[PDB]
């Protein structure tokens, strides 16, 4: 007896195209998404070239339209030079991404004044998401208040961060956040097994107390999002390991295991992988789209999942209960039992759908 879920949405993926296609491309990363029960992804802008201007966005849109197998929206990235220049294309993007700490990106902003300039110039009705760790969460929240608008905090990983966000919500501030599966299901206790290269990720893996604080504060978490950040094993095991984990294929099985164990409900999961992504990012419904999962099947995560070109996973060896059996996307069978059955280019840019534009005052 399968369970039918709506089309799930991952608001934080790195699909590496253009410029890092040995790590992943639109076709492989969206195959991974479909196999993970994800029918819509929002792709981050830290590509090569980065998606920081209109020509780069135009290129990325065409590469995604030609390669994506599921539907998508593309983020724009904030840079030290593009505030005030994105107004014509802003509404065609998922939102604006700010990189406020060291990570796999060349887009770090060097002054809080640059953050303010982005918050002041980006259209006020459109999403802003921030990579903001530890005190940076408080700092970007201050900038959001000074500019009288909302912000969404990416990949929250620490007790410190979730409690700060909790305090902000208690004061009625317009802040939302997401948590990635590695920060719910891995911790410092796993660094022995992973090693220092594979274990590299931003935010870094937390303590057991960090993990327990995220679970205890599930009510504060608006979304789950994978932060699918594929890099090859050679890169992760080499001299200058880039941070990041692949995660599209493992996110839903990990979370279904937690549902089966009573750690959160099916509804809690669907709020965080469907309804809240829709409402925060104004992402449209997908007609005739659903995911069928088998909640009884027990399996062990292998050394690599079938689709991501990362060809490794930090969850290797974990026992899960729950698997994706079938995905239907817009009336077509997109995935069955290990086979993706829609070609590259089946996926569409949801921001071009009439129902996918963000509503605004004239």
Binding of residue 287 to a copy of itself (CB under 8 A): yes
What residues numbered 210-229 form the site for Zn ion, per CB under 5 A? 227
Residue 186 makes CB contacts below 8 A (sequence gap 6+) with: 194, 205, 211, 314, 315
125 C-beta neighbours (distance < 10 Å), count: 14
Tell me: is residue 282 an annotated ligand-binding position. no
- Shortest separation between residue 170's beta carbon and a copy of itself, angstroms: 5
Question: With CB cut-offs between 5 and 8 Å by kind, which of Zn ion, a copy of itself, ligand NCD, none does residue 61 bind?
Answer: none
**Scanning the structure block, which residue is given the tokens 């994706």?**
324
Tell me: is residue 217 an annotated ligand-binding position. no
- Shortest separation between residue 59's beta carbon and a copy of itself, angstroms: 29
Question: With CB cut-offs between 5 and 8 Å by kind, which of a copy of itself, Zn ion, ligand NCD, none does residue 244 bind?
Answer: ligand NCD
- Shortest separation between residue 255's beta carbon and a copy of itself, angstroms: 14
Residue 335 to residue 261: CA distance in whole angstroms: 26
Residue of 210, 222, 227, 349 with catalytic role: 227
* Alpha-carbon distance values, 87 to 76, 120, 124 (Å): 11, 12, 11
**Scanning the structure block, which residue is given the tokens 């090859």?**
232
176 C-beta neighbours (distance < 10 Å), count: 20
Q: What's the first-to-final CA gap in the chain, in angstroms? A: 49
- The alpha-helical segments, DSSP class H, found in the chain are 26-35, 54-67, 112-121, 135-146, 159-170, 182-185, 191-198, 208-216, 233-236, 248-260, 266-270, 276-281
Instruction: Select 67 or 241, whichever has its Cβ closest to ligand NCD.
Output: 241
Binding stretches for ligand NCD (CB under 6 A) = 14, 46, 103-104, 131, 201-202, 227, 229, 242-244
Is residue 227 part of the annotated active site? The answer reads yes
Q: Choose, by CB under 8 A, the member of 88, 110, 111, 172 that binds a copy of itself.
A: 172
Binding-site residues from annotation:
12, 14, 16, 46, 97, 131, 154-155, 178, 202, 227, 231, 243
Binding-site residues from annotation for (S)-dihydroorotate:
16, 46, 202, 231, 243
**Active site (catalytic) residues:** 227
């Amino acid at each position: 007896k399968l369970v039918r879920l709506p089309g799930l949405i991952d608001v934080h993926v790195h699909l590496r195209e253009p410029g890092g296609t040995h790590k992943e491309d639109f076709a492989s990363g969206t195959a991974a998404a479909l196999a993970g029960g994800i029918t819509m992804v929002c792709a981050m802008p830290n590509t090569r070239p980065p998606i920081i201007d209109g020509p780069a966005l135009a290129l990325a849109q065409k590469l995604a339209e030609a390669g994506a197998r599921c539907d998508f929206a593309l983020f724009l990235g904030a840079s030290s030079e593009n505030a005030g220049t994105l107004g014509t294309v802003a509404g065609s993007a998922a939102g604006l991404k700010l990189y406020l700490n060291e990570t796999y990106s060349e887009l770090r902003l060097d002054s809080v004044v640059q953050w303010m300039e982005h918050f002041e110039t980006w259209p006020s009705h459109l999403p802003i998401v921030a990579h903001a760790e530890q005190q940076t969460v408080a700092a970007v929240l201050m900038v959001a208040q000074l500019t009288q608008r909302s912000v969404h905090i990416c990949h929250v990983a620490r007790k410190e961060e979730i409690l700060l966000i909790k305090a902000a919500k208690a004061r009625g501030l317009p802040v939302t956040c997401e948590v990635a599966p590695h920060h719910l299901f891995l911790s410092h206790d796993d660094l022995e097994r992973l090693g220092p290269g594979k274990g590299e990720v931003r935010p870094e893996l937390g303590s057991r107390q960090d993990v327990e604080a995220l679970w205890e504060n599930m009510a504060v978490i608006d979304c789950f999002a994978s932060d699918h950040a594929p890099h090859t094993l050679e890169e992760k095991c080499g001299s200058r390991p880039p941070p990041g984990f692949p995660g599209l294929e493992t996110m839903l099985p990990l979370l279904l295991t937690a549902v089966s164990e009573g750690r959160l409900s099916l509804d809690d999961l669907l709020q965080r992988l469907h309804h809240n992504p829709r409402r925060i990012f104004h992402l449209p419904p997908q007609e005739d789209t659903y995911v069928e999962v088998d909640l009884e099947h027990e399996w062990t995560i292998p050394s690599h999942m079938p689709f991501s070109k990362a060809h490794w996973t930090p969850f290797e060896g974990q026992k899960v209960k729950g698997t994706v059996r079938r995905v239907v996307l817009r009336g077509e069978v997109a995935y069955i039992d290990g086979q993706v059955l829609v070609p590259p280019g089946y996926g569409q840019d949801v921001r071009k759908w009439p129902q996918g534009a963000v509503p605004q005052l004239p």
